[PDB]
From Swiss-Prot, chain B:
Function field: Induces vacuolation of eukaryotic cells. Causes ulceration and gastric lesions.
Recorded domain comment: The signal peptide, cleaved at the inner membrane, guides the autotransporter protein to the periplasmic space. Then, insertion of the C-terminal translocator domain in the outer membrane forms a hydrophilic pore for the translocation of the passenger domain to the bacterial cell surface, with subsequent cleavage.
Species this chain originates from: Helicobacter pylori (Campylobacter pylori)
Protein name per UniProt: Vacuolating cytotoxin autotransporter
Swiss-Prot record, chain C:
Name of the coding gene: vacA
Role of this protein: Induces vacuolation of eukaryotic cells. Causes ulceration and gastric lesions.
Note on domains (UniProt): The signal peptide, cleaved at the inner membrane, guides the autotransporter protein to the periplasmic space. Then, insertion of the C-terminal translocator domain in the outer membrane forms a hydrophilic pore for the translocation of the passenger domain to the bacterial cell surface, with subsequent cleavage.
UniProt-recorded name of the protein: Vacuolating cytotoxin autotransporter
Length: 487, 248, 239
């Protein structure tokens, strides 16, 4: 109901907290001359001022800092050489860690996962857990702002995790990063390469399918090569995730939900940067235009579609304001329940270059029933109105599938809809031209205002009538077809 | 029993309020270079620090600022170019808006009306809702100091609306401006031309035919051409309205 | 009980109960004897002459229908010349004209969306349903009017001896014409089928029509259960 664009813009500009009892721990002598020892970090250092416990009401473990969840500690090593690991800090409520470890390799998972949560108190605090390692090497799962136990007890408020290496934030294959409703993540190394299941937005509680469930992975400072591998947004809710990237984002398999949004935001052109009381200036963001060389190379878009049936679809969507949105050879998949699901591959101020086969239910043809009107949807260059939607692969649409392209110049290589029929091939948003190279139609609802389709096929459709090619709007003045071929 | 000449002369010279928690929101980058986008203003900007709700007792909606009706916010754009709209802010109690929008066309109604009300507290506060757009273009109805629901619950105190464009405050045909018992209205553009039902004084409650029901449309600063089209004073009471015009 | 127009909802029940045969009639604390009733059998001459059954069907969409129903334990449930109507949303609505210990004598046209043919889409499988003489298992379901079922409409009759006068489903097809509850006989007088799912265990349908169904295949008359020993047809007529 609020939207992610308000939520991240109000959480990015905050004072951290006001904690009493600022603990300070300095790792003195002993650490800083064994370069290969494979220390532990919890037991050998942090367990002096991090106390476990039990919460009466849905506990598995319970961790805070010292005498409540409102006490900051800090660790100031700055020369401790070696390799450290957390390995089992689960349901950490805590508050305000910052483990300053220059020239120290971290390993934030070994034989057991990790978790970083807060509580919804009357003060509504964050966690602001920070790290400053050299490599990080996640290597086992990490759950940011998880559920503590099961539902009851105290609920979970927001959190912020900051991982600020200087040589790379890699990951292993089975490291499920799963950040939830209130969680963010700031990265600042070069060449993040998360080779595991990144899971933005999850069912925080057992039955609350109607949670907002926002998230953020703000990889803003990353001067190298962002490389996700398996991104998964949303689970049984309307999750609205957002990634403020660093204008080069190769990801791998993207798995949206039925009603899952995604706001990949490229940086701007020059890059980033009784008594009254004055709140500070809360600078807010609007939807701006990305820089010149902003590339988002998403290479596979799937959709997990099961559950209830609503009066329409559910309109899975992603929103990108980069100057390019290349979609590679994996193409587009779309699972389909009884109602027709809808995919919205939006682009605000850029282009779209899809180079893959538009599947549905993971096949190229993909027949769909009458109540299941699958709705592919593309928006290339909305707010600037000069963006092409180039589909360099020969697309193939079956029955009751509804492509619509609202761009400036929607180039193509071939559209094949004569197999299925009942296809709303909308082009109503097209500014001037739709330069289709090959067309196959049986019973279609083509609506183009100006084009030059240099090959046309007029198919038959069995014995029934009322089924026909229907150019259901004005054809204009500069229209053209270079070959009509009735069969 | 008092007369309007006392009421406006005592309400025109007041300090605004003494609010704690002066919120400040600045529209940063993103807005100020799309001249034709047709933004929303509530959902895209103002809903961060304006929270809805439900009043136990005659609610339809319920809006205030943040943690009660005694908190000022302000919006300082000063360069955000485009066209904005409110479109559905109904029964706004709130207090002390001022949406400073130079070179920004407003549209204070689209598909749904607007309302700007206060509550009769023990402090007896106003609202002082302000705007500073370039055109305004009302285009759907606006009810200043309305009834919140139906009679019961908390009653409505005075309010002040200020519309301070610099190119014209026009209106559409079906835009019923209906300001009530405590409401005023200050305009400061040139060439106000309200082509709709201006309704000074209305039955604020269901049966109170004996209310005083004052009002004011103080178009004092208007350097152009004032042009009403359909003015309607009073409804089933002894309403005493007053228009401090600009000599044409 | 003569009534007139009955207008059920999507999920509205109705328990018309005829009388029985002879007619009606610190410290502990003893509550009085709360005598409770079970579903009993009505008397001999218990007649419920409901003469029109409609259904108002709009609203949400559930994973099935909603199964409008009425439940009568009278010895007769005559339904007169108004017949049966059934409004249909996207899912197929269901009507359950149950009878516990009696007969059913429908003498009207089985409409749907208030027309006799009544085409319905694939997700809208309209389900007419009759239960004549459940707890005594000797009740006939006599339909003395020539019924007519269109497309994706699913009659099912679970009675002792479901007499008929004519079933016409060759116009619509995809019709589950279930008769699985039938004790012995289904004495249909005339049959028209195109792509049907007839399931009768014993019958004598003295007139049969084998229609075609366009050019598509996989659509056929399918006696999808055992036909038994005393079966009979007195005329088969392929077209």
């Amino acid at each position: 109901l609020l939207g992610w664009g308000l939520k991240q813009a109000e959480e990015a500009n905050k004072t951290p907290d006001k904690p009493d009892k600022v603990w300070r721990i300095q790792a003195g002598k002993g650490f800083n001359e064994f370069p290969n020892k494979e220390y532990d970090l919890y037991k050998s250092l942090l367990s002096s001022k991090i106390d476990g416990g039990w919460d009466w009401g849905n506990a598995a473990t319970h961790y805070w800092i010292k005498g409540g969840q409102w006490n900051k500690l800090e660790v100031d090593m700055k020369d401790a050489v070696g390799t450290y690991k957390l390995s089992g800090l689960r349901n950490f409520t805590g508050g305000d860690l910052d483990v300053n470890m220059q020239k120290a390799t971290l390993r934030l998972g070994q034989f057991n996962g990790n978790s970083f949560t807060s509580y919804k108190d009357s003060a509504d605090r964050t966690t602001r857990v920070d790290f400053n390692a050299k490599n990080i090497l996640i290597d086992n799962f990490l759950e940011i702002n998880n559920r503590v136990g099961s539902g009851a007890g105290r609920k979970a408020s927001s959190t912020v995790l900051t991982l600020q290496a200087s040589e790379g934030i890699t990951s292993s294959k089975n490291a499920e990063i799963s950040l939830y409703d209130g969680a963010t993540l700031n990265l600042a190394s070069n060449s993040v390469k998360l080779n595991g299941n990144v899971w933005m937005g999850r069912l925080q509680y057992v039955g609350a399918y109607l949670a907002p469930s926002y998230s953020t992975i703000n990889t803003s400072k990353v001067t190298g090569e962002v490389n996700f591998n398996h991104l998964t947004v949303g689970d049984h809710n309307a999750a609205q995730a957002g990634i403020i990237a660093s204008n080069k984002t190769h990801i791998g398999t993207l798995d949206l939900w039925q009603s899952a949004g995604l706001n990949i935001i490229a940086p701007p052109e020059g890059g980033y940067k009784q008594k009254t009381e004055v709140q500070p200036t809360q600078v807010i963001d609007g939807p701006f235009a990305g820089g010149k060389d902003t590339v988002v190379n998403i290479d596979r878009i799937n959709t997990k579609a099961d559950g209830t049936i609503k009066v329409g679809g559910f309109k899975a969507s992603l929103t990108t304001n980069a100057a390019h949105l290349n979609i590679g050879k994996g193409g587009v998949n779309l699972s389909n329940q009884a109602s027709g699901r809808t995919l919205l591959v939006e682009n605000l101020t850029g282009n779209i270059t899809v180079d893959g086969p538009l599947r549905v239910n993971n096949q190229v043809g993909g027949y769909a029933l009458a109540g299941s009107s699958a709705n592919f949807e593309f928006k290339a260059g909305v707010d600037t109105k000069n963006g092409t939607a180039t589909f360099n692969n020969d697309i193939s649409l079956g029955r009751f599938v509804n492509l619509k392209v609202d761009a400036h110049t929607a180039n193509f290589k071939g559209i094949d809809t004569g197999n299925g029929g009942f296809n709303t091939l909308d082009f109503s948003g097209v500014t001037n031209k739709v330069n289709i190279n090959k067309l196959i139609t049986a019973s279609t609802n083509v609506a183009v205002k100006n084009f030059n389709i240099n090959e046309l096929i007029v198919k038959t459709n069995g014995v029934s009538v009322g089924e026909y090619t229907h150019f259901s709007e004005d054809i204009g003045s500069q229209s053209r077809i270079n070959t009509v071929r009735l069969e």
